[PDB]
Amino acid sequence: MSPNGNLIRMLVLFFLESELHEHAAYLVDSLWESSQELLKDWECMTELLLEEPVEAMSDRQESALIELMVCTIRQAAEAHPPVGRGTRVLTAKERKTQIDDRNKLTEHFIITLPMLLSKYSADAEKVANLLQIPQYFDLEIYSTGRMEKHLDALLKQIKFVVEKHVESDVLEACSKTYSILCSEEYTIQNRVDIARSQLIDEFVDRFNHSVEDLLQEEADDDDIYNVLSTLKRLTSFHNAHDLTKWDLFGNCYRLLKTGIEHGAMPEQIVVQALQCSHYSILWQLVKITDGSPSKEDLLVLRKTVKSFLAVCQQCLSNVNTPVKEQAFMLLCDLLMIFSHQLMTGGREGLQPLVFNPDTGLQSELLSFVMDHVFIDQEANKIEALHKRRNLLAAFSKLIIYDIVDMHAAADIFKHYMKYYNDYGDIIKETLSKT
Ligand SMILES: Cc1occc1C(=O)Nc1ccncc1
């Protein structure tokens, strides 16, 4: 009870103080054969986190307990070592345990996860880590346990969280949590759908008034905060939720047009308005793949796509390189999606939606690569390199399927590989003689 609480308090200290385990997931996995009983005392944990002391817990150790708690909850639910330690056939008794564990952590965390979110509402890192939990719930128990009350509680708290936060980690964690609760059962489906589309509506109104405030305006620092703040939330959700019924593309399109014309739109507002527009378009495509869509259906989406390909192209010329990257990424996505590939799986109705990038665009997709993939000059650089890598791999796809001139490409890859082709073999010797 407090005998387990001491063992957990010390286990959190051995993790932080000793870089003998870097990764929580890996620590827990290693101790799992040997200390399963302790690592699934979930009441003991939620207690430590929620209770006031009689030695108090410091911000950093709390964070660590929460991260270890989630890792235990996974390993119990999945009943297999995490990604990186995997090698998968359970015995009668292993399976029987998995079922009993899942029941325990669900019954428990349904009750307690709302209270954890409550208490730690402003700690983005903590909230995002906590919201990884419902994915492991036996969601049917929101009916079985007559536990309707606690589902309202969770939803009340996910509201507070979205209303308080703008970090893309938190928001995404909030979007995924809805997707999980929202479609997993029918019993609960209806309830969640309502909470969601209320949450949305509130943020579309704010966004829309915020858009108007800004474009009508001299433009206040607040005018800029309000537009961005709301957009971010809607962009986050628009990935896994189909918000097409609210014409978001419309207002994003204006934001982007104003930033090109008068050239004075904040860089984060542009990037978000780009991403949000893209998500608008993919969900427009999905409805039009699955329906039996008419002529005008197609042609109205086409104009939307060309008017947007235009915006992304123009946005390559934005001063702020983050814009350029977003611009580029969406161009290299969209040009691939709205290729002739779109007439695979018998879907040759979609011919009018196909796009071939003109010369001027192809040349600017060659530009960016020389200017922003292949550049002259800690952990911010290994993360920066993997991105230019993705920007290039996304550009690679366009070259292979002849959507940009495959020879103009090759000549840039020639130019920058020059020293590998000129002096590489003489480097080869070196790393076999030293
Ligand atoms: C670091 C590196 O990256 C690519 C090539 C090399 C390289 O040549 N390293 C080296 C040269 C001479 N002695 C020892 C090592």
From Swiss-Prot:
It comes from the Eukaryota. It is found in: Nucleus; Chromosome; Chromosome, Centromere. The modification Phosphoserine is found at residue 292. Coiled coil: none annotated. Phosphorylated by PLK1. The large dissociation of cohesin from chromosome arms during prophase is partly due to its phosphorylation. Transmembrane segments: none annotated. Cohesin complexes are composed of a heterodimer between a SMC1 protein (SMC1A or SMC1B) and SMC3, which are attached via their hinge domain, and RAD21 which link them at their heads, and one STAG protein (STAG1, STAG2 or STAG3). In cohesin complexes, STAG1 is mutually exclusive with STAG2 and STAG3. Interacts directly with RAD21 in cohesin complex. The cohesin complex interacts with the cohesin loading complex subunits NIPBL/Scc2 (via HEAT repeats) and MAU2/Scc4. NIPBL directly contacts all members of the complex, RAD21, SMC1A/B, SMC3 and STAG1. Belongs to the SCC3 family. It is linked to Intellectual developmental disorder, autosomal dominant 47: A disorder characterized by significantly below average general intellectual functioning associated with impairments in adaptive behavior and manifested during the developmental period. MRD47 patients manifest developmental delay and mild to moderate intellectual disability, usually with delayed speech. Component of cohesin complex, a complex required for the cohesion of sister chromatids after DNA replication. The cohesin complex apparently forms a large proteinaceous ring within which sister chromatids can be trapped. At anaphase, the complex is cleaved and dissociates from chromatin, allowing sister chromatids to segregate. The cohesin complex may also play a role in spindle pole assembly during mitosis. This is Cohesin subunit SA-1. It comes from Homo sapiens (Human). The gene is STAG1. The chain holds residues 459 to 911 of 1258 of the full protein.
